[PDB]
Design a protein around this ligand. Structure first.
Ligand SMILES: *[C@@H]1O[C@H](CO)[C@@H](O)[C@H](O)[C@H]1NC(C)=O
Ligand SMILES: *[C@@H]1O[C@H](CO)[C@@H](O)[C@H](O)[C@H]1NC(C)=O
Ligand SMILES: *[C@@H]1O[C@H](CO)[C@@H](O)[C@H](O)[C@H]1NC(C)=O
Lengths: 225, 215, 364
């Protein structure tokens, strides 16, 4: 019966912040505590802060003590969490969950808010193929793919000829290099029979920009195969 | 104060394997101990709270006890099947300054794929990306069940590890992984090393493959 | 009608078929304001305690012990129970509550538990095996930071006789190592059974005031004297419901009335010794009680030889709680009201009669 939702942020930046709002509905939001718990990518869980019934006490952790402001309006049954001066290590997904009692667990959790800090805003990236020629035409599992680097968002869904040259694609997520550099790459299996028959053309599906340029790969068929 | 917890654990469907959570200061019998479960791609949920008891909805197979010997706890998760392969966390109120301390997490999985040696597939740079100075090194391996990828890099004369960074694998169709590696390169120092080898000791062979920088 | 008359061809007239009754839809529970709260405030923040071994016992009597303040605060530090389930203490009634309280330090909180015996197992207040209760120990370093280290809560140590469950270790017997008794002040292998306090605020973190108020429970054959509060639902009117008042329990509608009861008068009864009026526990409003609509069902048939269509007559019932035409004896559903007056063929009641005339339909 209890179904909580939360939103109010898709992208932030250093300095400029926002306020997360957790809509409380379903249950009776007048006899339970509230607390925020964030989750960093590739890490565990961290207790952000707590809050009293209406205005009793606002307990903060010594990590974010002095740069986070939590509030709760018991009249409209809402939970507001306003941020200010977002640091670099604050890149984590925040969750909203009510507290059954101060010495107990959380009954129902929220849904998650993708709040990340990253520079190098939306621009025009480029794609570069692999061209397996040296020790990948006959040694080991023959395969090939593409490479998308220096792209700010993560809307890319790498395909092959828009569903015309697909034979099994295992796409893995990218990783942040220093602060805004993401290196995405795909891979597709080849039976090692059409390397010099049909030229491969990889296509990108970047939503903000238009990365519809299919860079021609150069299979060095004269070197090894 | 910190909550210790094993990083990963794997077995086959059968007997139970409990998860330990040892404290660092204080007593374990002074507050309750809860265990949460976070499914990949959704919100966490409470499984067992007040380990001496168990709530409704969750089957009675998930059990837990209290070990007051060295301020630790145990979660005897019985009935290891495919619907229980997920992550688990530890939690216990210890901070007297109104702070809720959590665990580190676990990677409890199952065993369904047979053992297979990963192939060594190194990909040399290309010419279109090599306009002025730009290239990458792709040593993606496949056909391997364990996710603990252990690879190495050496430009035929030295184990170059400056800027070492690996790629996170993704779940393939028949429960596989695609863990790769991405080592930093030298844009204006391509003539220093005319060969690049990719070694891997991920529970198998150690054959290395060499390539050419620019040809 | 054919099933009740045990035949296939019936004649004209009005026959009794069955007896319908409306069932209550929901239930309403009403209890007055939660007054007479148990004085649990003076148990935590009050004057200092007598001593460690000389702990004071405070019994509990008829009161309203609300648990919404124990596990909903942050001033405490330990709330580990031993099979109490504080989430359901509001729906559990006990008879014996032991409000034991004494003063310990931070390192002695662990030694006081049914699962961890030792220094507090035979020298001070001991805990039983079952011990249905929760330990309440908070850090009392707010204002208990006096200078000089006042040692007044001297706890008795190195005692031979083990301490009994829920007892005090009062015994002025000097420690004898196994020799002749000194009968004096630290004579031949003698030690006075007292230990010196003085955990000053500039001594250590583990040596701090940690006054603990031990709380337990015990069930006996005596009636439940101490228990938590109860719940209450929303008031509903003009609907056949099942009321669940404090002293009243039954079915019927709950409408408003113009009656005025005396300050002490709560119930309401008629000449036939039946409940007909109830007073609202929460507010001050006299709620009338009236049984829901009942009665038998009668049919008006012109005979199976002429036709087969019949009508129904819910006798004594309003046409709202059930073409339709309100008569003086029920609601004749399945007949039209004609203004022309004819001879009475099928008697219904209060002059109204039915007949099968003209297109053919039952008229009233
Ligand atoms: C004492 O503790 C109780 C906890 O139930 C709290 O409500 C109260 O405000 C405190 N102070 C006094 C003076 O009672
Ligand atoms: C106490 O009784 C009055 C009498 O009408 C009522 O208005 C009030 O709501 C009651 N208090 C609570 C907390 O319900
Ligand atoms: C039946 O219910 C209606 C609807 O409120 C009411 O007006 C009427 O007085 C009631 N009694 C009769 C005999 O119709």
């Amino acid at each position: 019966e209890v179904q909580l939702v939360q939103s109010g942020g898709g992208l932030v930046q250093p300095g400029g912040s926002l306020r997360l709002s957790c809509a409380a509905s379903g249950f009776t939001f007048s006899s339970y505590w509230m607390s925020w718990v964030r989750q960093a990518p590739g890490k565990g869980l961290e207790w952000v802060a707590n809050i009293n019934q209406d205005g009793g006490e606002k307990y903060y952790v010594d990590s974010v003590k002095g740069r986070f402001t939590i509030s709760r309006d018991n009249a409209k049954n809402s939970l507001f969490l306003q941020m200010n001066s977002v640091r670099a290590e604050d890149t984590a997904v925040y969750f909203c969950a009510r507290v059954w009692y101060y010495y107990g667990p959380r009954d129902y959790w929220g849904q998650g808010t993708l709040v990340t800090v990253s520079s190098a805003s939306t621009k025009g990236p480029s794609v570069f193929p692999l061209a397996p020629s040296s020790k990948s035409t006959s040694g080991g599992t023959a395969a090939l793919g593409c490479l998308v680097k220096d792209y700010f968002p993560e809307p890319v869904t790498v395909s092959w000829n828009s569903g015309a040259l697909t034979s099994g694609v295992h796409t893995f997520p990218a990783v942040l290099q220093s602060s805004g550099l993401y290196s995405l790459s795909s891979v597709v299996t080849v039976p090692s029979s059409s390397l010099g028959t049909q030229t491969y053309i990889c296509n990108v599906n970047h939503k903000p920009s238009n990365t519809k340029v299919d860079k021609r790969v150069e299979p060095k068929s004269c070197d090894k195969t | 104060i910190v909550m210790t917890q094993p990083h990963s654990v794997s077995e086959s469907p059968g007997k139970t394997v409990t998860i330990s959570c040892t404290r660092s200061s204080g007593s374990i019998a002074s507050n309750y101990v809860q265990w949460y479960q976070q499914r990949p791609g959704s919100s966490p949920t409470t499984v067992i709270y007040e380990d001496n008891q168990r709530p409704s909805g969750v089957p009675d197979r998930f059990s837990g006890s209290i070990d007051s010997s060295s301020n630790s706890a145990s979660l005897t998760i019985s009935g290891l099947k495919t619907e229980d392969e997920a992550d688990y966390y530890c939690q216990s109120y210890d901070g007297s300054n109104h702070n809720v301390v959590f665990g580190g997490g676990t990677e409890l999985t199952v065993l369904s794929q047979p053992k297979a040696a990963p192939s060594v597939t190194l990909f040399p740079p290309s010419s279109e990306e090599l306009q002025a100075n730009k290239a990458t090194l792709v040593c993606l391996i496949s056909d391997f069940y364990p996710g603990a990828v252990t690879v190495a890099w050496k430009a035929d004369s030295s184990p170059v590890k400056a800027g070492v960074e690996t790629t996170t694998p993704s779940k393939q169709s028949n429960n596989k992984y695609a863990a790769s590696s991405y080592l930093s390169l030298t844009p204006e120092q391509w003539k220093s090393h005319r060969s690049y080898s990719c070694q891997v000791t991920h529970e198998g062979s150690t054959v290395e493959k060499t390539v050419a920088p620019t040809e | 009608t054919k099933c009740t008359l045990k035949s296939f061809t019936v004649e004209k007239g009005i026959y009794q078929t069955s007896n319908f009754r409306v069932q209550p839809t929901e239930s309403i529970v009403r209890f007055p304001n939660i007054t007479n709260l148990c004085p649990f405030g003076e148990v935590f923040n009050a004057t200092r305690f007598a001593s460690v071994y000389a702990w004071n016992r405070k019994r509990i009597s008829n009161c309203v012990a609300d648990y919404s303040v124990l596990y909903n605060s942050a001033s405490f530090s330990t709330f580990k129970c031993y099979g109490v389930s504080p989430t359901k203490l509001n729906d559990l009634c006990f008879t014996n509550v032991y409000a034991d309280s004494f003063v310990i330090r931070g390192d002695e909180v662990r030694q006081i538990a049914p699962g961890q015996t030792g220094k507090i197992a035979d020298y001070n207040y001991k805990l039983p095996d079952d011990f249905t209760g929760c330990v309440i120990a908070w850090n009392s370093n707010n204002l208990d930071s006096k200078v000089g280290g006042n040692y007044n809560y001297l706890y008795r140590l190195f005692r031979k006789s083990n301490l009994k469950p829920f007892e005090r270790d009062i015994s002025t017997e000097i420690y004898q190592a196994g020799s002749t008794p000194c009968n004096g002040v630290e004579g031949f292998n003698c030690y006075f059974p007292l230990q010196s306090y003085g955990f000053q605020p500039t001594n250590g973190v583990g040596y701090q005031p940690y006054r603990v108020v031990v709380l337990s429970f015990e069930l006996l054959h005596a009636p439940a004297t101490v228990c938590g509060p109860k719940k209450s639902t929303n008031l509903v009117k003009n609907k056949c419901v099942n009321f669940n008042f404090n002293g009243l329990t039954g079915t019927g509608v709950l409408t408003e009335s113009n009656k005025k009861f005396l300050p002490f008068q709560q119930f309401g009864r008629d000449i036939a010794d039946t409940t007909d009026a109830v007073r609202d526990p929460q507010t001050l409003e006299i709620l009338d009680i009236t049984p829901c609509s009942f009665g038998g069902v009668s049919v008006i048939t012109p005979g199976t030889n002429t036709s087969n269509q019949v009508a129904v007559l819910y006798q004594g019932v309003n046409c709202t709680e059930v073409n339709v035409f309100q008569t003086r004896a029920g609601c004749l559903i399945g007949a039209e009201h004609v203004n022309n007056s004819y001879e009475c063929d099928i008697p219904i009641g209060a002059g109204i009669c039915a007949s099968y005339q003209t297109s053919q339909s039952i008229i009233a």
